[PDB]
Structure 1
Amino acid sequence: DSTASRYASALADVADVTGTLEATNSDVEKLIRIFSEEPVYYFFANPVISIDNKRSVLDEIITTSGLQPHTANFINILIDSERINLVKEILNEFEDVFNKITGTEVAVVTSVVKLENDHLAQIAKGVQKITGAKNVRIKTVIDPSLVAGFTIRYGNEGSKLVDMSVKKQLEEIAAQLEM
């Protein structure tokens, strides 16, 4: 495991023991869109800034968006330890550990064109029947490089891949050269 993965596993474990896992996931999405937009990251980093000013501004940002307290507790502990500079990576791996704990799996269906929602749910049926996740989430990405079909990037993170696409030509022609 990575340090970001450990901290994210802590946050997901607390959001597991307290029945606020979905609210905490939404709160992490809010917090990662906060810790994007560099100047905020630059402020919470830069150890020249005094710790009291940092925690005060963090309290203000907490009471602004109405976060869950244990997630606010998580960011405040991140400020306590010197590991606040990993905050983007921790909030990024939170999605992984949260999907693993709540039991759902992500399948990024990348096709040439946007896909119908019922047929996307059919893709979710299939991916679920090979993975075995409860609420399989499908975030689709329109792509111009593909030609007719689609690619699925289900798995841990990109790990498994099935694609009926320009890869059809690519494999037929890797077997056409035959050297």
Structure 2
Amino acid sequence: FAKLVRPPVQIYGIEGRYATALYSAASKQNKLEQVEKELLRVGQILKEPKMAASLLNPYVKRSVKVKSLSDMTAKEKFSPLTSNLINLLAENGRLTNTPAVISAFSTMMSVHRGEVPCTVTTASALDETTLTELKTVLKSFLSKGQVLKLEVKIDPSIMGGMIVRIG
């Protein structure tokens, strides 16, 4: 059917399924970078009338919808050939849905060599290396901030219940 590669991200949030199209497509030929960045342009290029109810609006009529991307994405060279899925997803109504793909993707070459705290203490420092939680604890141990409430603050929480939890 097509023997291919769907590398990190993966995960198939449907928009992970989408991502995976370009996770083999962009990824091959490595118009990864072109597109990875393309998306970045697009998202917010989009989401106003060139997204909103001057688009997404089903009451636009689908062909016309193509012909307002293909007038919106062959409106932009930010999809010089990865437009087509646009113009497909377009049809396939996945327009509001693009962030997840975009993310997933973009993440799928960023979250395709990163890491993020997920930890029983504060961070959202995030990282772009696979090896980690060693490096970061030197940026943690460095800078002091975040919501503090941001990750575990193992205080109100754990600990906080505990005497209560004994009684």
User: Which has more helix, going by share of residues?
Assistant: 1
TM over 0.5: yes
Answer yes or no: is 1:105 the counterpart of 2:114. yes
Aligned to 1:14: 25
The equivalent position to 1:128 in structure 2, one of 126, 131, 138, is 131
Pair 1:82–1:57, CA change in 2 (3 A): closer
CA distance in 1 between counterparts of 2:37 and 2:128 reads: 25
Report the aligned-residue RMSD: 3.7
Contact 1:8–1:91 (CA<8 Å) still a contact in 2?
Answer: yes
Residue deviations 1:22-67, cap 9 Å, x none? 2211111222223333662323322332334322321343355531
Aligned to 1:138: none
Aligned to 1:41: 52
CA distance in 2 between counterparts of 1:107 and 1:10 reads: 24
In the alignment, structure 2 segments of 5+ residues that lack a partner are 1-11, 135-144
Aligned to 1:176: 163
Mapping 1:8-157, distance limit 5 Å: 8-37=19-48, 40-62=51-73, 65-84=76-95, 86-100=97-111, 103-107=112-116, 124=127, 128-129=131-132, 143-144=146-147, 146=148, 151=151
Offset at residue 10 of structure 1 (A): 0.6
TM-score under structure 2 normalisation?
A: 0.62
Offset at residue 18 of structure 1 (A): 1.7
TM-score under structure 1 normalisation?
A: 0.58
CA distance in 1 between counterparts of 2:107 and 2:160 reads: 36
What is the aligned-residue identity percentage?
17
Aligned to 2:14: 3
In the alignment, structure 1 segments of 5+ residues that lack a partner are 113-119, 132-141, 152-162
User: Which has more strand, going by share of residues?
Assistant: 1
CA distance in 2 between counterparts of 1:76 and 1:126 reads: 34
